[PDB]
Design a protein around this ligand. Structure first.
Ligand SMILES: Oc1ccc(Cl)cc1Cl
Ligand SMILES: Oc1ccc(Cl)cc1Cl
Ligand SMILES: [Zn+2]
Ligand SMILES: [Zn+2]
Lengths: 196, 196
């Protein structure tokens, strides 16, 4: 049920070069407390609104790259088994523990409906460290990744939103992803992914 | 290098918890392209000088945290051996391949003069690809890390600077670290490490 094995062969640590590679993308290992401190400076000086955009887009770029890696290992993987490489990649990257609740996907037909549980999210625990409990969900980067990955996989914009978030006192995160036009505020969610 | 083998044992993947740990500090695997894209947005909107400080301070926090890890492993190690853990962790994290050249350290005496070679500096590759060759050295986060690691380790302000940088088109990066007092522009360099 897990593709963590098939996708781990794609992860090379080259200690005698000082580089890490996931597929054909170079990675770094970064301290979450380092990213936390950057988030603090970004919210404090740019506001929660602008800061959230910067992270969602960073997240978006990451998800799109991992969709590219997923596409190369298609061979005979169903649409769903294709989709599932996203949550797998998220875990391996140590961002969060992803659990697909229910997923309806057809790539050819442009149909997608997806719900997930986000157990153990760094962003959530990182936001809490730096700001305490939040009024709105705080897994920005993580949400940008889901949007980026799924959109690049479908060839059309799939936006995600957190229906529940540990950053808001909840026990875990709960997220929903579906085509842009099935969101009433979708035009305005989509503006969050635009640099400027 | 014995440091790389001993320290690499401190890194573990706990996928059940969707987590990656280096010692007692949680880590994520992040695409350098995603970080590069954030660097570009921050430079485009806040300008080079302010984007530089943000990344230097992010690296600093990283360095200070790896220093806390090296300290727990302070046994049987000379002052040099403990200093060497910084370069090793930086390399393990895939940030850059670090070659210590000459290192003069005595922690109890407050003695520190350190020169280092950097190859494959992610900060250098990512900057050139988003901005082209730069005028001044471009590996902000990497310098912040050496500064934070060594200051934490020495118990006093050690500042680092690139005398050469691939982001300026040189074959490599060359780094000098030494106490605040021995830098001509020392006070101005210390300024970059404080928020706004
Ligand atoms: O965390 C995730 C990463 C990729 C996809 Cl498609 C969904 C989720 Cl919840
Ligand atoms: O890249 C580095 C990491 C730690 C220390 Cl002490 C020096 C350097 Cl140049
Ligand atoms: Zn959340
Ligand atoms: Zn450099």
């Amino acid at each position: 049920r897990d593709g963590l094995s098939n996708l781990a062969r794609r992860l090379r640590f080259a200690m005698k070069e000082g580089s890490i590679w996931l597929g054909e993308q170079r990675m770094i290992l970064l301290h979450t407390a380092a990213l936390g401190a950057l988030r603090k400076e970004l919210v404090d000086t740019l506001g929660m609104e602008r800061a959230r955009g910067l992270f969602m887009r960073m997240g978006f770029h990451s998800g799109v790259r991992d969709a590219e890696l997923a596409k190369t290992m298609r061979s005979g993987h169903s649409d769903f088994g294709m989709l599932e490489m996203g949550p797998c990649l998220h875990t391996i990257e140590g961002v969060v523990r992803v659990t697909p609740l229910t997923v309806d996907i057809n790539i050819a037909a442009g149909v997608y409906h997806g719900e997930f549980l986000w157990e153990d999210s760094f962003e959530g625990d990182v936001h809490r460290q730096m700001f305490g409990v939040a009024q709105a969900p705080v897994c920005w980067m993580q949400i940008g990744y889901a949007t980026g990955y799924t959109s690049a996989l479908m060839g059309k914009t799939i936006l995600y939103r957190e229906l529940e978030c540990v950053g808001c006192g909840h026990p875990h995160c709960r997220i929903l992803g579906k085509p842009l036009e099935q969101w009433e505020d979708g035009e305005a969610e989509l503006a969050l992914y635009q640099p400027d």
